[model samples]
Target: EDERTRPARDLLAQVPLERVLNGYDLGCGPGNSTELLTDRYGVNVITGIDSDDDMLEKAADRLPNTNFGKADLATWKPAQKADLLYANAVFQWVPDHLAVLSQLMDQLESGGVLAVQMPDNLQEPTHIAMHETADGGPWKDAFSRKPLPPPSDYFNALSPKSSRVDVWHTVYNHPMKDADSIVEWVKGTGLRPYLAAAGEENREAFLADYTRRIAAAYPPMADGRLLLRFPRLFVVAVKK
Candidate 1:
């Protein structure tokens, strides 16, 4: 959660579309991406949509000029079509999100955009370390998740409907203080659900075990900061 802003802003910079009238930020966690959208198109016109009320409450306070609402990406139906669907670091969590992307893409007004960013780290060492730790521990059964398909899968789906589709992958190496920092970072994301399912009795032990694996997986640099590599996929599709 702490390292999210940089990635989100980095993604926003890659977006090609501008002059959007109204847009929705799906899974707008803490409104980071939504804030970026607002930064570009201004407030009141961009709505931050998230299922978490806690994030919604904070987002509303952070940007009162903008709108914040609750909705699951899997089944969210906008009351009106939008010019932009700017979803940063969001879609991977929604079941069959490719289908959801198609749904949102079809619902947009002509020439509108469907911009998205998602962490493509399921195969990264940090994430693989999570799987390794979970499998070897008592919390093995508590884990379950999935990943995105090939890039062309998105291209094939969106290209036919859009005038253009821009897709790219970027791997960011974040220098962290130590392996323990990575542990705490994962706690906000992939590790959170596992911890919830692991139950209180096993949580601490599981975290300790995962941290050890993380330490082994990522060695420190000469500067003494561990480079936590995070890979993300981005797509910007403009409707025909």
Candidate 2:
């Protein structure tokens, strides 16, 4: 999570934390990022909210000083209006981002800050390769019944009021050692979605086939590193 999560950290940098009275870290996985904000940035009265029970437990164990809550981010309401709301790499999985954002926007105190970072890597080689591999391989019929929607429409969730929304885009190009590194990359984040549909044994088969193609599809550089371009989108606004 260190260097790879720069996009999220960069999005967080858009808003300066100067002694926020109340703040919420939506989807505070592992509490690593939360610790950075509370300990390093001096943000007090911070709350960590995550849907995953395991993640909440980890965050509680890691950052005992901060209050933790288990709730769906799409419907989370803190005890009171928050002065700052920060979410990273979580909204894409949730449905109705626009409605969710509107509800959360209402939860912000006057002059409050909202900073959200979403990975737009849906079009990247790694992701597209997965879809293409699935389509061309034995799993073709499974997804053929229910095709996925394009990712471009996700941007509509950001209400384009100049006074409320200031959207930004940044590309983070990560260099992995090779195709195997790309496999390792998918193991954590991407594996969950595929594993749910294909099952464990089939997921391994899909990965084996996908990795074979990935080596040829994304050949490594002479130095043995593959450039994994991760494009991210950021939407930060203030409640006037």
Candidate 3:
């Protein structure tokens, strides 16, 4: 509901509302956003997929009409080609998004549209603070063994195949009440991998240090909300 999320709302609203016979929400989380499309667009049938077991359970309960399943998007092959492939805030979780996007494009009908919204807010305070957390301190040596790849590498690969790719960026200045709230917000959205990859004893330490760094990076606003700016990128492509 904050300004940081308005662009996604606007971008997603642009999804061609034509009723489709079938569609898929790859990496659909909890089926909340997926339900919005299914209800408004009148998609005859939809399958929401996620790799996490718990999320699948919650999605199944939330959207009964839309089938929820556990499937890895990176390796998933649709049983049938989709008229529209809907992915929102999910592709980044996959390491090779273009590979999957290319595969999806190949499977679409000639005029099919790929509606994708990815948060390109790497420069945001939340992300910068987290990156700093890893770059400095003890975590530095751990990542030095094998540095992670940037998101742009994935976007570049899609450029060639896309006949009409609309690339746009925006800053969602979501002024939050407190810096600590920003840390908590990112905890749900960004810290999943770190917690999963960290050792049990190190997880708490990492969280504490990361929170401290994030607090210093993003100061609170006048209304007590921290001005957390989220930069996002999107593309709506028509298969040639």
Model 3 segments more than 4 A misplaced: 1-8, 138-163, 195-205
Clashing pairs in 3: 176-225, 176-226, 177-224, 177-225
The models' CA-based lDDT, in order, is 0.83, 0.74, 0.69
TM-score leader: 1
Task: Indicate the residue-level lDDT of 62 in model 3.
Answer: 81
> On residues 5-107, what C-alpha lDDT tens digit does candidate 2 reach at each position?
5766787778755768888888889887687567645545778889899998999898877888889876888888888888887777778775687678788
Q: What tens-digit string does per-residue lDDT give for candidate 3 at 1-240?
A: 444446546666776646667677777787766776677665447778789998888888887656777888888867777767778787777776777887778877766667777777655667776667766657566655122234464356555655666656666676676766777788766766665555567777778888888778876666656677776667677666
TM-score of each: 0.93, 0.87, 0.81
Model 2 TM: 0.87
**Worst ten-residue run, lDDT, model 1?**
1-10
lDDT of 1 at 126: 76
Q: Following a full C-alpha superposition, what root-mean-square deviation does model 3 have from the true structure?
A: 3.7
**Model 2: CA > 4 A from native:** 40-43, 145-164
Order the candidates by TM-score, highest first.
1, 2, 3
* Stretches > 4 Å off in candidate 1: 1-3, 138-144
- Checking candidate 1 for backbone clashes, the offending pairs are none
